[PDB]
Subunit: 212 residues, 4 copies
């Protein structure tokens, strides 16, 4: 499993703190983790929470990441943005119970967190705890176990509905503001991490044209 | 302002509790509130959290409601479902601060709540408090006030992106499973509340054909 | 009603933020508020969370304050310290529901809050909300209303037990480390606020001897 | 280490749920756990939250338990009661971070939890998580590690102050309402668990006279 971290500009100063805990849990589980920034350093490429959503969609739909951690001050903006694209099921979690329930009941491929609201002394403990419970069990097993059938069914039906409601990502990538798109993929490590791990060549090819 | 309440089957037994607090705040503010159920009574029409999303989309896009309150056990399923349709900006809130921030920073048209996780003694106090802070200030004013400009801008840019990513609701309504759709709008008060308040005649007309 | 605010050294930088919200709610209700510090300024007299407890006990037992707000990083240290003295019933609250329940179920005379754990973006909103619900209703009314009888009874029985378990405050003041005591009452505004409002002349007299 | 669980009458129906998680964590760690009730069965001996405090004090001061878990609807009543006796340092915790911080910063011998407020779907997950973090590290190590010195010092100073403020437990046991005391120790398993593990023969002897 490949896990990506994406921070927007308001919470970029916490990227190191967040990555430290995510990396620790990932290392323990044998996952691969990629820090796509923002990193909290001067004159780096910038992301808004809306661009976090777009980048999340690019990473997940391409196969470059299997799961994305992102967020903002309250976590709600990034959640709203991530869920505005096809192929993204982005939850919200504030505590470790939220994270476990998300993995077992919803079984999505992204999670948005508050990195400022409620984020103070011991917040990195909460992050570690949350990440641990998020990956404690393989996703989609159901909670409680006896309710797995209807929970899995509804997640399946949601997926079927999303196939009808969203336009395909390639068309979206071509029609959105191209400066907005270019900025979203201008991170210092984007090309390195993305193109090495991308499994959708059509998306890779179009993004190459945007960058070259 | 017209506010709609939508509950799915797992939390239907709490509909009266939830509506009581929502109604109280609404009455105080001079809003109109519509309880679309589920109501928690035997042999009533059923909704899953995925159908909550569809119904939310129908009410908001048609103009039948200006704001929707919904949720499920954890609130995440309904949030995911609501945000899978065009014209819906559905947040999550667990506490009153979450609700205030949602109205001021994101300024969406729906909110999904946990009605089971963390929902115990004094949960109706939390609901009242949450609803009060949700409508304490007119939406989109920004928090803090000095950050209103970039917050309003990003919400605007999200809206622009959603115009490209979602297919139009009418096409969705025609292409989704029609039994799934019919059930979603088979509530005892749906026709009464919806058709009296619907401002989009094309949606009304198609839903009439589904029901007749 | 006279309300006192007491901060220890780790959270002294937040005193202004905390007092602003407490003052606002107090002004609205017609209460009197006294900021006993710490204030977060260089070379001011220092307090630990244990001294917060002692100062709380001095203010409440003397009648100089009717209610005390205090806390520390997590709020637990100050709570433990406050409850180690006679005549003090110090609760804990993290959210507005906690505060309402404390006033109605326990009806104590002090509350300890976390000023660092969970204290981030929008924390001053939480403070205002918490203070508003804390003083929304007169204390000891019971929650729910129908359970007022046993709740009031148990609070009464607790008070009876405390009369047996604690030694009287005057003896405590004489036997504790006198440098520890002197420091606790060496705040720039202690004499001004305390002696003007003290109703127990025996405590006033002994503290005068400690200071003179 | 010997861990005791004490529930009062309002939350007695949750004793099995609570004990299940406490037992699991205890078994994993090689601790001994004793369920002192209430158990949630008809015509059992009753405890109020004030009697929870007294029983906690008896178990800890006697050495019958090294740590006590208790609580009530909100957890605040039991906390207030426990901290009204000598030899008891009873914290409050709502989440796993609270529990870790309590063990490392305060290092007390009891914890009071909310078993109703915020206690709903997945509450037993929260309990397990909380208990796991509570005993993850040996108590009193300090958080962060670099602040261990002043944290340990203040806990030590609190202990010194408590030696002056509380009257000795034996005198308390003799002077409190004796029917109140008798009821507190009339649990079906009290004699079995207490007398087998009591290390203070003076307390054992007096309680024998109360019961015989």
């Amino acid at each position: 499993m490949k896990i990506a971290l994406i921070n927007e500009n308001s919470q970029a100063s916490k990227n190191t703190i967040i990555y430290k805990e995510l990396k620790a849990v990932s290392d323990e589980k044998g996952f691969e983790v990629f820090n796509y920034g923002m990193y909290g350093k001067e004159e780096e490429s910038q992301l808004t929470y809306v661009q976090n959503g777009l980048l999340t969609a690019i990473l997940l739909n391409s196969g470059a990441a299997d799961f994305v951690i992102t967020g903002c001050g309250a976590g709600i903006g990034a959640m709203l943005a991530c869920n505005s694209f096809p192929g993204v099921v982005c939850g919200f979690a504030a505590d470790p119970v939220d994270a476990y329930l998300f993995s077992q009941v919803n079984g999505g491929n992204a999670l948005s967190l508050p990195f400022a609201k409620g984020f103070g002394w011991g917040a990195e403990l909460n992050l570690r705890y949350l990440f641990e419970r998020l990956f404690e069990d393989e996703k989609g097993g159901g909670y409680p176990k006896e309710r797995a059938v209807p929970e899995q069914r509804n997640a399946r039906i949601l997926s079927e509905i999303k196939q009808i409601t969203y336009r395909d990502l390639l068309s979206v990538l071509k029609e959105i503001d191209q400066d907005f798109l270019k900025e979203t993929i201008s991170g210092e490590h984007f090309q390195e991490y993305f193109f090495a791990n991308c499994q959708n060549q059509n998306i890779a090819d179009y993004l190459k044209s945007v960058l070259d």
